[PDB]
Amino acid sequence: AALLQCTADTLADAVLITTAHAWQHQGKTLFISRKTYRIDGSGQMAITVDVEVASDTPHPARIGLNCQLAQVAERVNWLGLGPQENYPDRLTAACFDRWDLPLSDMYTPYVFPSENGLRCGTRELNYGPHQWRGDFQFNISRYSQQQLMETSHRHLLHAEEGTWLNIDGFHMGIGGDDSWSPSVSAEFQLSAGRYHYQLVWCQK
Amino acid sequence: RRDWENPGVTQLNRLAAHPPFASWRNSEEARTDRPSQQLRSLNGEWRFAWFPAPEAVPESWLECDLPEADTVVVPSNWQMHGYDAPIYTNVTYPITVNPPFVPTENPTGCYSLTFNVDESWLQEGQTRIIFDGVNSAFHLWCNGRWVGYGQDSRLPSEFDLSAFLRAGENRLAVMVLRWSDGSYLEDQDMWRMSGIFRDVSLLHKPTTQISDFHVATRFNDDFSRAVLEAEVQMCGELRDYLRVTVSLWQGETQVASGTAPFGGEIIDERGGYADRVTLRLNVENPKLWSAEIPNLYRAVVELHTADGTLIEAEACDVGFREVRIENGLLLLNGKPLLIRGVNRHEHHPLHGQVMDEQTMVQDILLMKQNNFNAVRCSHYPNHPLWYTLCDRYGLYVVDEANIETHGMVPMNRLTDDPRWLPAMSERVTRMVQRDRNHPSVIIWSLGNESGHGANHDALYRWIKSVDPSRPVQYEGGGADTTATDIICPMYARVDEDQPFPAVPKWSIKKWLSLPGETRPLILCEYAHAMGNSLGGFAKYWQAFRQYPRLQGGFVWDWVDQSLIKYDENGNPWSAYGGDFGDTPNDRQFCMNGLVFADRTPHPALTEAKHQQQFFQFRLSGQTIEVTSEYLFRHSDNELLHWMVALDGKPLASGEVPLDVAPQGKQLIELPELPQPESAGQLWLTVRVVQPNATAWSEAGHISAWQQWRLAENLSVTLPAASHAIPHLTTSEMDFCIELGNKRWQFNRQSGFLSQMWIGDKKQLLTPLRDQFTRAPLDNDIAVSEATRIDPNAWVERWKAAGHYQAEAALLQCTADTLADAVLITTAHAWQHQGKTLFISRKTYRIDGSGQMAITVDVEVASDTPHPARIGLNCQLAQVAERVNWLGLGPQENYPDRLTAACFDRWDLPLSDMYTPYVFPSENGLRCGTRELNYGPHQWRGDFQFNISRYSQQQLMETSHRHLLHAEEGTWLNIDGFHMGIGGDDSWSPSVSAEFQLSAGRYHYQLVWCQK
């Protein structure tokens, strides 16, 4: 990430932070992310994200945010598709409802670890004292993506401190027509060029 | 007798049907297709009188011209001259359905002509009269004596006048009935007119003459050898000294010839045809005919005495081609066709159903220029010159019998009735008899929308027996009945099934594989081009290219059937159904063309040209792969032009000749290019240009194109700090922002941008407000009527939900002062009777450079019908001469109809940004636009827009283009999102799901600035 802009403004009942960043590689701009964070008297933090993805870069795996929360909580409660793991091209069986599971059920122990446990079509997510509202896809677990990608076998994974939360505005399909060639259908690739998503993070 | 109310009497004294004759008496004139002294035209000024019924015609008319008659031009349709009204009805008959009777008030047209006959014509031989087209039935008298009668408005009726004429002056009297029993078989979707609307001629033939001739061409396995076989029949004095010589010419060279006496092979216990002879000519390495290379030979048929006297000669152009269906594919000269077709009615806005050479040529040129290779004679045999022109210019033809009984209930009531077999047989048999020697004709059709009756089965078999060289098709009764060799549905969708009981229209892809099915599938009609339509056209072409057995289709249709009317002032205007007092009527349903009645294209034409391209392209790296879809020719008149531009600015370009064999591939490696560090998207556009003119196009004609995005360099460079900060002033009713010479005013009661000044000049006539509706397209209205609401049509669903009348409720309107800008925030709710349909949340950020950034986020209730658009609109005070944009163009393009458009910088006169569809609706949109410039304004983002002098409300409220009036200023519609236009059909919802705005939440953003 390269910073382009970072400003702060006060409005009548809130403070507005505005940022812009570019992600580059070998001098090429891959992605540009523009955001606004508006924090109001109610304590709700409204996050707006507008991303540009260069047309000539391979369509990305996801367009989201992530962070490592300091806390660990017993349950995960959401209003979205579930209860089990579901992805864009594999979510027909999931149902829109209010689901509540222990944190570990939000992690899928595939023998060869990878991105896993996403839930799509979520409008509200509750974890510890935190609540996130919007229309997004998310995964939450004790393992960073970095770990999952560096680890060959599930038995060798170790819970990190805290909880890693990935909240996505958009996520690529998983494919599977075959597993020895590109198998994600065009309609599930993030090829729109410009994406927008918005979330509200507030306290419970 | 009322022979016009008796399907058992379709003619009286009519001569047998046959292929075009001219009775040349010199073989070289026949070879050259020069005029024949023995074939005269009686076209010109005739005498005419109109009567309300046949009972009103006075007997004196048989012997004398009526003083009150008018002199009129023939051929013509009398409605075109104003004698009575033409009627526009689609399915329902124009007369009460009570076969075989017709109304007793039945417009009768009394035509007459005094003409000359030279004595020589009467000293020997036979003199006949030929009426190429009389609608719908007629009695003929010559010199006051009754000659005969004929029915079938679309084929020639011939009568021998030998015994009725005299040297010098003679007078014809033709009593034409508008309605007859033949009308029950002429219910095609078109204007219902009448008269002597095709040519009238007089032909002299010798007493011993060629009465028919059939030419066939058969080949060996690889088409390197052929045998032309010509069966010739004579009438007259049969004698042993007679012979027939058939000679075959390629230009001035005689390639083959055969001579034989009459007397065919023994056929049965009683012998053979002593009045027939079959000549067989071997032809080595024949030049084959196709729509791609219409190679033709000339066959001259000489009837002569053995010792050398030519009696008469007949002739035809011959195209060596084989048509056959094998293994489920329609093959032409052994290769599978891909039909880029169109249905074409014979229509002229001034002349009605009278066709002329110019018009026909004009149409074939445009068809070819637009990548069509085939035409369906919807729905009757055409004027004879049509076939000659398709044979010479090269178009594949589906010749269709003049049989349509759509309005019956059920549709096969007459076609399944043995009593109507005779009438139907004539329509099929006479067509085959006349048109069987034209190579352009590749498929015979039994007629249209007449259900499926046993009469169809019988006639299907008759053709199969008499002419095994062409497949027979017929759509009625479900498009895959036992009366068709080809599955030929109308408006079947690509992926979507429409399972109507008894006659379902399956997805074409699914249809091919139903249990036991094996036939090829070619839609006889698809892509209903009514108004702003052709949405989803590319979906059909992708399917056709992907599945071998999907062999194309015929678009509906070529030309709008509008008619010219004149206003008080005498200015012409385009009329449709009901415009002549005609009722019941089907309004605008008569206009479904790719082109306007004067041949001006509608925007959809470029979409068809593009999807129908003959060259396909793939890009890998800087290697372009060109694939030819031609089956027979090499790309010998083609060059590849390539150009790279950055956001519309040319950076490089070149040309490469194309050398690709039919079905072949050519790899083209592009040069090291521009790697610009400057911001923007690089775009590659390639075009195939024909350097040399052809019979159908001018030098430089563009036949195909394609575009691809190449490298993109996203701008990361920051705007230069401004030495200014807009000032805000507030009152209870407004928020006013000032910056330099600029000012913005926002109304606090409505929540909208009410005015803007540049300098001190007001810029808006109406505020900028959200818009979620469109002036409905023909496809949105479909078959809805005020008198008969269709609740499933889009327009009706939007109406019912209140979209057109919902009112914006202000939920919030705030102003904030930033470090370097003023920020206005608003939110509105659109509601209708208790229900919140849409919520619009926006921010307007006006900074120190004078730019206004607008962000819009809309929510759409999931249970309201998906809206036509999600955008803003306003009436600008200025009117500027040009419109310049960076986006898709240059022509009108919509989400489901934009493949043909190319992204570039376009600049057109304002008026070009409006599409004058006869029936007004939402029109002129251009999609995928990044920057729009109009006068002093500039708008940037990623949107679709239209701009014109006509409001959506005005377009929605006016039924005819000629009644529209430019409003003050210019109306601009800038959409974040716009619904597809549809058109798979125009009488049901046809917009594909992926083109409906059903996302629930929508985001768009624009920046409005100056210059």
Ligand SMILES: CC(C)S[C@@H]1O[C@H](CO)[C@H](O)[C@H](O)[C@H]1O
């Ligand atoms: C309106 C449908 C029930 S019939 C539909 O009408 C169209 C009108 O342009 C064309 O005539 C089509 O051939 C016909 O199938």
Ligand SMILES: [Mg+2]
């Ligand atoms: Mg009759």
Ligand SMILES: [Mg+2]
């Ligand atoms: Mg000779």
Ligand SMILES: [Mg+2]
């Ligand atoms: Mg003589």
Ligand SMILES: [Mg+2]
């Ligand atoms: Mg019809």
Ligand SMILES: [Mg+2]
């Ligand atoms: Mg009507």
Ligand code: NA
């Ligand atoms: Na891994």
Ligand code: NA
């Ligand atoms: Na095909």
Ligand code: NA
């Ligand atoms: Na029509």
Ligand code: NA
């Ligand atoms: Na060439």
Ligand code: NA
């Ligand atoms: Na209208």
